[PDB]
């Protein structure tokens, strides 16, 4: 029962349209619980989960001002990169960032990360050790010296190993009825005859949480991965996801190919079949 | 850098004509963030647009979900019209209940 806590930051420069747009969103696993948009009536860290709005006013002030300031640090960071790369003033550039902590089944941290990307391509990431840096290009190496002398990687190790865990833990105990409630997938098989012998047999998996799911088709135990089309896992909207896998099977052979589902919500993996 | 979005138009719950349902349009994989997305009822734009908050993937590509409550019928045709900096002309993707 391994979980996670990640924070997403988007800072896109819009020259002429005033000042850049900052959109920072907080997630626990696949559950969106906090958000901040720079362009808002009065910008503040907003609750998106019932367990997070339970937290006190002094919490909401802290969280708000950090994002309010991050936006400004990002606004300057954009101008800094414009000099680094010697690029156009009028151009619209993107600054992406994501930091978070991956916690185990018994509450202790396994993976910590602080990676960021300029214009859609990786810039500088904090390595698994939580004490090292890897720069993508030569301009990413300027930030490296800056963050290796100011020991930025140390505080991050303290946050990720410390408070990141303490809070992901608080949040896990806070909204357990929505977070630790493993939703099993409501599955079934749909038959599409096509024409005569070749028929498409689709395997549906809807209403499951989290997004991690493995769907396969098997002809007498052999994986038909080469001849199976699989859609990317998509959100239904109601806190749950959906995904399908289909195979072209000739008529008569329809009662050989079996569908296989693997999910947290299931105790034993299901070997469901098409039944008229 | 410029990457075109990957559209997916599906329903929340299975196909049942007359039943109260939701029309989803999962646009993902696009870069930069600027994306114009509209949903359609028989080719006519639906004004009741409601979309998710801008999040990116581990490959740094963004993703948004434009959703609206709809009533599936037999004669009605529902599509989703996407437009991105990469897109030459607005990408209209029709909805299929078997997909």
């Amino acid at each position: 029962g391994s979980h996670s806590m990640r924070y997403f930051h988007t800072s896109v420069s819009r020259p002429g349209r005033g000042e850049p747009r900052f959109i920072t969103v907080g997630y626990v696993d696949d559950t969106l619980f906090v958000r901040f948009d720079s362009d808002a009536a009065s910008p503040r860290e907003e609750p998106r989960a019932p367990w997070i709005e339970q937290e006190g006013p002094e919490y909401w002030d802290r969280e708000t001002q950090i994002s309010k300031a991050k936006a400004q640090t990002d606004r300057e960071d954009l101008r800094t990169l414009l000099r680094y790369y010697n690029q156009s003033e009028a151009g619209s550039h993107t600054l992406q960032n994501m930091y978070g902590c991956d916690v185990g089944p018994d509450g202790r941290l396994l993976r910590g990360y602080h990676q960021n990307a300029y214009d859609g391509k990786d810039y500088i990431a904090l390595n698994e050790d939580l004490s090292s840096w890897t720069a993508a290009d030569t301009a990413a190496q300027i930030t490296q010296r800056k963050w290796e002398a100011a020991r930025v990687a140390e505080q991050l190790r303290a946050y990720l190993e410390g408070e990141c865990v303490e809070w992901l833990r608080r949040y896990l105990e806070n909204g357990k009825e929505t977070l630790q409630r493993a939703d099993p997938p409501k599955t079934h098989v749909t038959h599409h005859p096509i024409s005569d012998h070749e028929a498409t047999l689709r395997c549906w998996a809807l209403g499951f949480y989290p997004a991690e799911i493995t769907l396969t088709w098997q002809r007498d135990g052999e994986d038909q991965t080469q001849d199976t089309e699989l859609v990317e896992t998509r959100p239904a909207g109601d806190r749950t996801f959906q995904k399908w896998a289909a195979v072209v099977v000739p008529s008569g052979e329809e009662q050989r190919y079996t569908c296989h589902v693997q999910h947290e919500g299931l105790p034993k993996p299901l070997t469901l079949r098409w039944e008229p | 850098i410029q990457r075109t979005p990957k559209i997916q138009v599906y329903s929340r719950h299975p196909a049942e004509n007359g039943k109260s349902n939701f029309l989803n349009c999962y646009v993902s994989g696009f870069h930069p963030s600027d994306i114009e997305v509209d949903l359609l009822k028989n080719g006519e734009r639906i004004e009741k647009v409601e979309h998710s908050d801008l999040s990116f993937s581990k490959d740094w590509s963004f993703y948004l979900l434009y959703y609206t409550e709809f009533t599936p019928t037999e004669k009605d045709e529902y599509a989703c019209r996407v437009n991105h900096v990469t897109l030459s002309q607005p990408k209209i993707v029709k909805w299929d209940r078997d997909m």
Partner: antibody
Amino acid sequence: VQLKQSGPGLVQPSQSLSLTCTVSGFSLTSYGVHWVRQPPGKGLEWLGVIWSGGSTDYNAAFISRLSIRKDNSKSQVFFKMNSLQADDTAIYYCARTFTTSTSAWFAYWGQGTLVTVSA
Amino acid sequence: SIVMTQTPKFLLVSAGDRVTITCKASQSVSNDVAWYQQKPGQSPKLLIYYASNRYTGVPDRFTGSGYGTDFTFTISTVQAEDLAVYFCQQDYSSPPWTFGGGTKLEIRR
């Protein structure tokens, strides 16, 4: 970090080309594997990619006949191209950019599979 | 779909020379260019990335430059090992990401 390719080296006209690119040193569920061909003595041509999540991008001139699918557990990525012809005779490499990003500059490449469209 | 024009198609020079290649894009690409070395019977190997950045393990003799439309690749010291077909690439556009024609590096002895 390696990409081991395997598949038939001769295809009869109007038939498919099923290829397999077996990866290692990295997880499939994270990175994206591309497919780029090279006609003998000619330039390079990017044909398609399969992303981390199972999403795909195909070179438009190929979209109907092309199909890339992957088995994350078995570290394999398959490339099936239907109804081959003389213009498709080339070496097929599977490639990857240095990081998880949707970048197209290829740090790592396969050894290539020489395919010959002939009766 | 940005046409990348590679010049010259052929390049013959003696050892210890400074040779230049030019890849010109039909449309602007904000430093999203790559440079490869394809030795016969072997795969193309990434020399440079992002126009000016040398890939890990690639020597100092191989240096790239340029931004937006004009892009050049220059070899500090030509060696017998450098013999190959040199290509360039674009990654700014949408998914079809073009390649240059190629530069056949022949040597004088």
